[PDB]
Amino acid sequence: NYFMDISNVLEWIIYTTGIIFVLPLFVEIPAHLQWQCGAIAVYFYWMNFLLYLQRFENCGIFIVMLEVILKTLLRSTVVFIFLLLAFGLSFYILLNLQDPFSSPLLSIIQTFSMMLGDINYRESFLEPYLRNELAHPVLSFAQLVSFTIFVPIVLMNLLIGLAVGDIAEVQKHASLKRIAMQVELHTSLEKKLPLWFLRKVDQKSTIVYPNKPRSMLFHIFCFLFCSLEMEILKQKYRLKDLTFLLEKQHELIKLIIQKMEIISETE
Amino acid sequence: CPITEMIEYLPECMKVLLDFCMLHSTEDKSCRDYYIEYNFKYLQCPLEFTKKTPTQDVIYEPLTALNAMVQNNRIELLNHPVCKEYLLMKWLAYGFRAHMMNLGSYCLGLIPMTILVVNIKPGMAFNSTGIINILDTTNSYLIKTCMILVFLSSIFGYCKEAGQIFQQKRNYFMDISNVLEWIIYTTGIIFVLPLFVEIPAHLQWQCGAIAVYFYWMNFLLYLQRFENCGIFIVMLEVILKTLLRSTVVFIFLLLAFGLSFYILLNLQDPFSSPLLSIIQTFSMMLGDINYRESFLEPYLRNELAHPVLSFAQLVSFTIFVPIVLMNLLIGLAVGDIAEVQKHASLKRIAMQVELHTSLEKKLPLWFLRKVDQKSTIVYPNKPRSMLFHIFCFLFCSLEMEILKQKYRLKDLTFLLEKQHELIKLIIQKMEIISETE
Ligand SMILES: CCCCCCCC/C=C\CCCCCCCC(=O)O[C@H](COC(=O)CCCCCCCCCCCCCCC)COP(=O)([O-])OCC[N+](C)(C)C
Ligand SMILES: CCCCCCCC/C=C\CCCCCCCC(=O)O[C@H](COC(=O)CCCCCCCCCCCCCCC)COP(=O)([O-])OCC[N+](C)(C)C
Ligand SMILES: *CC(=O)N(CCCOC)c1nc(-c2ccc(OC)cc2)cs1
């Protein structure tokens, strides 16, 4: 049941790679492989260490917001791939004589770096144009203005709007989510402990002295640790009771007319 | 028809009517032989009323109840499991095959041009026997077949497009997808023509650039038919239309700053011509001002005519365009995306049911009689049929209450009026002795 879990996979990568980084105390290994593994291990240790901050109360809401934004980015990745591959192969054909666009894969990585707005207009477009070093100059400037309109303007603002919507959705229900994570942590931890330890550690009542201060280190830890629908439903209940009582009263009045005595008002 | 009437007026009774269409077999969820049956007898008309007939004057569009539920925004009925199984059956009947055929007929022209680009150095003239610089062999068997595939795909695209010309009859003129197909087909023809007529390499690569741009740009429009992707395409459409509405304010403000910098900074190379100055200010829009290179270092060498006016123009440009205008575009994008995601879950199922009800009107009636079904049987205990697992991994109210309140209060005041009339009748017919005067 643990196969569809990324935390297990991160632990596998960390443990194997940290084994290979340390093995020269038994078996001699070339230094290239050793530092190649040390890089991946030091990356994934501190990357995995964010997942242990989810258990705290002052931190876990940022981790769950980061999770939501990252999943939405994973949903947009296919539009990213196709649009970026379009612009990358177009710049590969247009700007072949320059060093950043020599290979197609280098051109794709260059357009991915140009995504944020580092276009390098003067170095790659203008100064080759003033030295007659651009084949197809008009097509090149038209490609430049089309790339500037599509990717850094439209797509980035799309990501910003998606992030704003997701963060508003998360912070709609933050205060319930915090206490839900705490009670889930305790009710999952309690199912594994033995029963005699539960009988020996629990309590049934607490006594709090508000005048006496609590027990320096605790002060530093405290510094680091720092409805219409139900109303209309009640309205509906009261109106239903009202119409029931009025029906009974109407029946009694018809009984009065049925049993009434009429003299000197007939015909 | 009363089913459409129930969808229009009382949808919560249609919910119960759909609840009668779900049958549980053994009422034991642990059994491996346990199943449930879905019946689809109320969701559509008989198929004879669908096709136009000289005897039957009236017609009905296919998927009747689903179209009626889409036009009345009854999403709680669309999320009912009988409707989900109905769309799943309708997709596995004929939708997947027609969709994969329509995608493959385009991908057959898409792939070989990308192969032909990434396996030939640009700028060189290439022919069926190889690359001319002397002739380079050892790839000619691949290059020849790729050029033949692109040529054949382009001429069959012409034939399909001319069929749509003689079919649609000038209603297709206000459509950008037809125009993109025209550009793709003509330009891919011109990129491949040296297997018949010799063409200079400059025109050949000039056409190859435009073709490889517009193939992958057009290929985004075929992702709109999927469910996991099309909402991004429609959000991109909305944002791009709003940018097209703001383009005139862009043009006037940018032309102001461009001609001002053309007059001020004439001695520098990026502002030599007026059109180059306009393109330079358009590039400076995002925040790449080049303060040190264009403003400060000419000032410390006494190379600026009008220095005070130049720095005032710099601070005015920095305030207007990268601060105000970009934040205006961000606010417009946030509002439009919130508006789209207000109605996402209805829009997805609406696109799916529109795709099926548009595809079904063209198929012949005997094929409809031979492919459809009336009931499905699902075994929840037995897993479905590796490749399917990879495909599943890649594929992963106050107003009505106050209205009811108003109805009940109106009934209440009607009954109280009748009761008041009866009490006045009691006083009219009552007998009074020993209480008179
Ligand atoms: C030209 C190129 C163009 C390319 C564009 C492509 C664009 C596409 C971009 C991104 C899409 C892919 C995202 C990859 C994983 C995201 C899912 C995820 O972690 O969310 C969830 C946590 O979310 C969090 O809040 C945790 C965040 C920390 C994890 C970071 C590890 C990443 C290191 C990799 C770097 C590798 C590089 C190595 C190089 C040396 C985990 O999933 P879950 O099951 O929901 O929750 C279970 C959580 N518990 C219970 C386990 C706690
Ligand atoms: C100094 C300069 C300053 C200038 C500032 C100017 C700023 C102005 C900027 C932009 C305004 C102009 C935008 C042009 C078209 C936008 C309309 C459009 O596609 O929306 C809709 C789709 O929307 C989508 O979601 C599809 C998106 C993909 C299409 C990309 C093709 C563009 C390539 C061109 C590049 C050319 C360069 C060539 C160079 C070699 C299509 O229209 P629709 O009818 O609503 O929907 C029908 C959709 N179906 C049914 C067909 C599916
Ligand atoms: C409203 C609609 O979609 N239906 C419901 C179908 C369920 O009952 C079979 C319609 N029914 C008719 C109809 C007309 C004539 C005949 O021939 C006997 C059958 C059904 C038209 S739409």
UniProtKB/Swiss-Prot annotation, chain A:
- Mutating residue 59 to S: what's the consequence? Decrease in activation by hyperoxia and diallyl disulfide. Important decrease in activation by hyperoxia and diallyl disulfide
From which residue to which does the signal peptide run?
none
Entry function: Ligand-activated Ca(2+)-permeable, nonselective cation channel involved in pain detection and possibly also in cold perception, oxygen concentration perception, cough, itch, and inner ear function. Has a relatively high Ca(2+) selectivity, with a preference for divalent over monovalent cations (Ca(2+) > Ba(2+) > Mg(2+) > NH4(+) > Li(+) > K(+)), the influx of cation into the cytoplasm leads to membrane depolarization. Has a central role in the pain response to endogenous inflammatory mediators, such as bradykinin and to a diverse array of irritants.
Residue spans that sit within the membrane without traversing it, per the record: 105-125
Topological domains, Cytoplasmic: 54-65, 164-267
The protein's PTM annotation reads:
TRPA1 activation by electrophiles occurs though covalent modification of specific cysteine residues in the N-terminal cytoplasmic domain. Hydroxylation is required for TRPA1 activity inhibition in normoxia. In hypoxia, the decrease in oxygen concentration diminishes the activity of the hydroxylase EGLN1, thus relieving TRPA1 from inhibition and ultimately leading to channel activation.
Q: Tell me what this protein is called.
A: Transient receptor potential cation channel subfamily A member 1
The species is Homo sapiens (Human)
Q: What is known of its domains?
A: C-terminal helices from the four subunits associate to form atypical coiled coil structure; this region is probably involved in binding the inositol polyphosphates that are required for optimal channel activity (in vitro).
* Part of the whole protein covered: 798 to 1079 of 1119
Where, by residue number, does the polypeptide cross the bilayer? 2-26, 33-53, 66-95, 137-163
Site residues, Crucial for calcium permeation: 118
